[PDB]
Amino acid sequence: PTPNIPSDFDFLDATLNLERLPVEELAELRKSEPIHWVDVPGGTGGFGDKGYWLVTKHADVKEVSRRSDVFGSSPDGAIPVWPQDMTREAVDLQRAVLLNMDAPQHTRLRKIISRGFTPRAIGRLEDELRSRAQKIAQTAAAQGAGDFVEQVSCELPLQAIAELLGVPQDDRDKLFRWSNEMTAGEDPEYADVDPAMSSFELISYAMKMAEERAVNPTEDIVTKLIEADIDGEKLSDDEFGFFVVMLAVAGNETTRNSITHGMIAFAQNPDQWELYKKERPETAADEIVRWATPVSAFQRTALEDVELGGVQIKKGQRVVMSYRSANFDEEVFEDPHTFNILRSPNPHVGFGGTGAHYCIGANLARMTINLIFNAIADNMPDLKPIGAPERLKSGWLNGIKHWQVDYTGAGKAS
Amino acid sequence: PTPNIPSDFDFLDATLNLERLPVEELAELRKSEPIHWVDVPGGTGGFGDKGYWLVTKHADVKEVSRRSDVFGSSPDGAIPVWPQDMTREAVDLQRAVLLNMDAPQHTRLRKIISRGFTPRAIGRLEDELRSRAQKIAQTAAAQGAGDFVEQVSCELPLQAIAELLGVPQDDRDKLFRWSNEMTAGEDPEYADVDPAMSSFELISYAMKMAEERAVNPTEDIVTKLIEADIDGEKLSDDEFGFFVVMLAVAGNETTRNSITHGMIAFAQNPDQWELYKKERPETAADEIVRWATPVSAFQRTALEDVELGGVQIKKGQRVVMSYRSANFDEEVFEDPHTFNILRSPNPHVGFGGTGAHYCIGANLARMTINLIFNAIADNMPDLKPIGAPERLKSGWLNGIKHWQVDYTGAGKAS
Numbered sequence: 023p024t025p026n027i028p029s030d031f032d033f034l035d036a037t038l039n040l041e042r043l044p045v046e047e048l049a050e051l052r053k054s055e056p057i058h059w060v061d062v063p064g065g066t067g068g069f070g071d072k073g074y075w076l077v078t079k080h081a082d083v084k085e086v087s088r089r090s091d092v093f094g095s096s097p098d099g100a101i102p103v104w105p106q107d108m109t110r111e112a113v114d115l116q117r118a119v120l121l122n123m124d125a126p127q128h129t130r131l132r133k134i135i136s137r138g139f140t141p142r143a144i145g146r147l148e149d150e151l152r153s154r155a156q157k158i159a160q161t162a163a164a165q166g167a168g169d170f171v172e173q174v175s176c177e178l179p180l181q182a183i184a185e186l187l188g189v190p191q192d193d194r195d196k197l198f199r200w201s202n203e204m205t206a207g208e209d210p211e212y213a214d215v216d217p218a219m220s221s222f223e224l225i226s227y228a229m230k231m232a233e234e235r236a237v238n239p240t241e242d243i244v245t246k247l248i249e250a251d252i253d254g255e256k257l258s259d260d261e262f263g264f265f266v267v268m269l270a271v272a273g274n275e276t277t278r279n280s281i282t283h284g285m286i287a288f289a290q291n292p293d294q295w296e297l298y299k300k301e302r303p304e305t306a307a308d309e310i311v312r313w314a315t316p317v318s319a320f321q322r323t324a325l326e327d328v329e330l331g332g333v334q335i336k337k338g339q340r341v342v343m344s345y346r347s348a349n350f351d352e353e354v355f356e357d358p359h360t361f362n363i364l365r366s367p368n369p370h371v372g373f374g375g376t377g378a379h380y381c382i383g384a385n386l387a388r389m390t391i392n393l394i395f396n397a398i399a400d401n402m403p404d405l406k407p408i409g410a411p412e413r414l415k416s417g418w419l420n421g422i423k424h425w426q427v428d429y430t431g432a433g434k435a436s
Numbered sequence: 437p438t439p440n441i442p443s444d445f446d447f448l449d450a451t452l453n454l455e456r457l458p459v460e461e462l463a464e465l466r467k468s469e470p471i472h473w474v475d476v477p478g479g480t481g482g483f484g485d486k487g488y489w490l491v492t493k494h495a496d497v498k499e500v501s502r503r504s505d506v507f508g509s510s511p512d513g514a515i516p517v518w519p520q521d522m523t524r525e526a527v528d529l530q531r532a533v534l535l536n537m538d539a540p541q542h543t544r545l546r547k548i549i550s551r552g553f554t555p556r557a558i559g560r561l562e563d564e565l566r567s568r569a570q571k572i573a574q575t576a577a578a579q580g581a582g583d584f585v586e587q588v589s590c591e592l593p594l595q596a597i598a599e600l601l602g603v604p605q606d607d608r609d610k611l612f613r614w615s616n617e618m619t620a621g622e623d624p625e626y627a628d629v630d631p632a633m634s635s636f637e638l639i640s641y642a643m644k645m646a647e648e649r650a651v652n653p654t655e656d657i658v659t660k661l662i663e664a665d666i667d668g669e670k671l672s673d674d675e676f677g678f679f680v681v682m683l684a685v686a687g688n689e690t691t692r693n694s695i696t697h698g699m700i701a702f703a704q705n706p707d708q709w710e711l712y713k714k715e716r717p718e719t720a721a722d723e724i725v726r727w728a729t730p731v732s733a734f735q736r737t738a739l740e741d742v743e744l745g746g747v748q749i750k751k752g753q754r755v756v757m758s759y760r761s762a763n764f765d766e767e768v769f770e771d772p773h774t775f776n777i778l779r780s781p782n783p784h785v786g787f788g789g790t791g792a793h794y795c796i797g798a799n800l801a802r803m804t805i806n807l808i809f810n811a812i813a814d815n816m817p818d819l820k821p822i823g824a825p826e827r828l829k830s831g832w833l834n835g836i837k838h839w840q841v842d843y844t845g846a847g848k849a850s
């Protein structure tokens with residue numbers, strides 16, 4: 023333990039993170055106790071255990087990510103914190119989707135699924151997503167002022183998934199509503215929704231899509247995921263359904279927040295925004311992800327006793343990787359508190375550390391970021407905030423729910 | 437069509453059935469148009485089709501039940517009616533559970549599952565369920581007056597399932613709450629609950645139970661369902677989970693309602709109740725089921741064009757079996773409107789017509805009925821209703837939500 027941070031301060035508490043990320047407190051851990059046990063003696067939400075290890079240094083996050091053979095994802099899932107009313111049963115079945123699977127099942131499925139995320143499958147979407155990014159940005163400009171999250175940030179991540187899967191235009195509204203309902207989480211603005219019913223309707227929709235594409239193949243990835251290869255490897259129709267569930271939760275709010283936070287960073291750093299509009303540099307999307315770190319943390323569970331950074335971790339204890347801390351590690355990044363869209367090298371972990379679960383959508387995500395920031399630069403170069411960003415109440419997803427913005431930059435109607 | 441019943445009268449409408457079963461209208465169909473098309477031109481809830489065939493004669497219900505090769509259960513599920521807000525996606529995935537499966541998948545699973553429902557596996561529960569029935573009935577007697585549904589009808593069906601599966605006593609309250617939440621349906625008293633989240637927690641609980649029983653076998657059925665036979669046939673752990681989901685919806689409200697309706701019948705027919713208390717006849721449980729017909733109707737979907745009772749049914753049309761009608765067919769039952777606990781023979785279809793989906797729990801159900809009616813006769817022989825039964829709002833499950841009853845039969849405290 024370390025005098026500056028008492029062991030009962032819970033870095034993943036959703037009420038705390040609603041107010042602020044615990045940035046200063048993470049920095050004290052990096053300095054003085056880089057692998058730190060948090061006490062939650064009355065029992066953690068969902069898990070029912072009495073605390074967790076928090077891993078705050080970049081090198082150790084990469085170490086945990088690389089050693090999946092001792093740091094598993096399936097005993098407890100990757101999401102590191104839940105409300106007090108989450109049940110152990112609801113936690114235990116996160117493992118129906120890729121993120122929360124260990125070998126051999128994860129290994130087989132990730133190999134199949136990687137067919138969908140080649141530079142070719144992703145570059146094929148680029149023209150359509152550019153064309154959608156430009157319209158999103160123009161339609162929003164046309165309103166003069168509004169909620170930048172709903173009007174600029176939200177749509178392109180969901181269209182990227184719709185375009186990747188070849189979702190019929192008439193099906194997009196329900197797909198998108200199921201995706202948004204699925205991640206209702208613990209914010210009171212979303213208390214009314216049914217995440218499980220939404221996720222059941224989505225699976226059912228996706229399975230029907232697999233059945234159809236089996237008789238009528240397409241140019242989209244669905245066809246490649248469900249066609250047996252040399253060794254008869256392919257997703258079954260319900261594997262495909264759980265894959266679609268995976269994408270809807272993996273590729274929506276994460277990219278949406280990288281966009282919202284990127285724009286906030288630009289609004290706080292006008293010179294970076296001038297430089298952006300003028301060069302469109304290729305290093306910008308990665309600085310945006312580092313800066314947003316949309317996933318603040320994900321965890322593993324020790325599968326046997328293991329030593330890590332000189333600390334003895336015992337089998338069954340959770341080990342939480344702070345990507346928010348690691349992305350500002352003073353030993354890895356020069357001036358980590360400067361938003362620099364030319365930052366290079368930029369070995370951020372917003373997509374995870376290299377390893378079995380490294381984000382499969384990462385290039386699709388950078389492409390989404392590049393497309394919308396180009397559209398914003400092209401169609402609303404002078405936007406300025408009218409209001410404070412409102413934070414999402416979550417202990418692990420760095421979300422912004424709303425941010426009032428003047429698109430014309432001069433109180434204009436247009 | 438027939439002049440007395442216009443084609444837009446919807447026999448499965450939940451608002452109509454909340455007021456009454458359409459008994460007189462079923463009787464006109466048996467007389468004049470025993471296979472009858474109902475028009476729902478604005479689209480049926482869940483299914484989105486424009487109506488259904490209703491099958492009202494006993495012989496034709498048995499015919500549809502026998503011919504599973506042309507009357508399938510998986511295209512649309514067995515439940516024959518849903519509210520307008522039910523989605524096609526939610527319907528399409530009913531087929532994750534046995535009731536809604538066709539061959540070959542149903543065939544393999546029903547064969548495995550029948551290991552759990554032998555006269556031996558069911559007779560092994562009898563002492564414990566007798567002992568629980570007696571306590572239920574005594575604890576209720578001790579209150580003098582109360583809700584007969586909550587206090588006498590509810591518990592023994594849920595304990596039968598708990599005892600069948602060897603559910604730990606400390607787990608029964610959550611199991612039972614998940615079961616009750618799962619069948620929330622469309623009654624406003626249950627609008628607040630989450631059936632899908634409940635059904636997800638239950639699956640997860642059941643899978644963990646399968647994992648445990650694999651390392652530590654038991655005398656209960658779980659062990660027999662998950663042990664590979666000669667040919668390596670057994671439920672996988674998630675098959676077991678979907679099996680438990682099946683039981684929680686198959687074996688709770690159905691038996692609960694056979695008990696409630698049996699007692700109402702006894703209260704309306706005091707001589708039958710005297711005769712019961714005096715002989716405990718063995719034919720009583722089956723007359724109670726015929727009389728309650730807890731499932732009013734279940735359907736199939738034509739898998740190809742077929743002729744039935746001289747009527748041409750086209751592929752993809754739903755064919756709804758009215759068990760409520762068939763159980764009062766004047767050609768099969770002598771005086772079907774007389775509640776006679778000595779009725780013999782009694783070829784009722786409350787458990788279905790013989791065929792691939794005939795109720796697997798039927799003897800467990802009769803045993804539950806016999807046990808609780810013996811306990812009621814033994815411990816509250818003079819009970820009398822204080823209040824009208826309140827109906828459940830459902831178009832297909834003949835439920836009673838509450839019924840105020842004086843257990844002492846003389847306004848006594850005890």
Ligand code: HEM
Nearest residue numbers: 120121272273276277280372373374379380381382383387
């Ligand atoms: C800026 C946006 C995104 C961020 C910050 C992000 C971050 C992450 C992280 C942190 C992980 C876990 C890494 C680990 O445990 O090592 C992950 C995994 C994953 N991501 Fe993303 N992600 C983003 C966008 C997307 C998109 C657009 C998709 C696809 C449409 C996607 C699909 C997935 C999938 C399928 C996994 C699971 C991979 C596996 O478990 O093997 N992600 N992402």
Ligand code: HEM
Nearest residue numbers: 534535686687690691694786787788793794795796797801
């Ligand atoms: C009085 C109480 C009950 C009634 C009225 C009832 C009625 C029915 C009916 C009508 C069916 C469909 C028959 C068909 O489609 O031909 C069915 C199926 C089934 N029942 Fe029951 N049931 C009752 C109790 C139970 C109980 C106690 C259990 C077990 C705990 C149970 C387990 C099942 C299962 C698993 C099926 C699906 C069989 C298959 O699809 O192959 N039932 N029941």
Ligand SMILES: [Cl-]
Nearest residue numbers: 218222632636
């Ligand atoms: Cl579900």
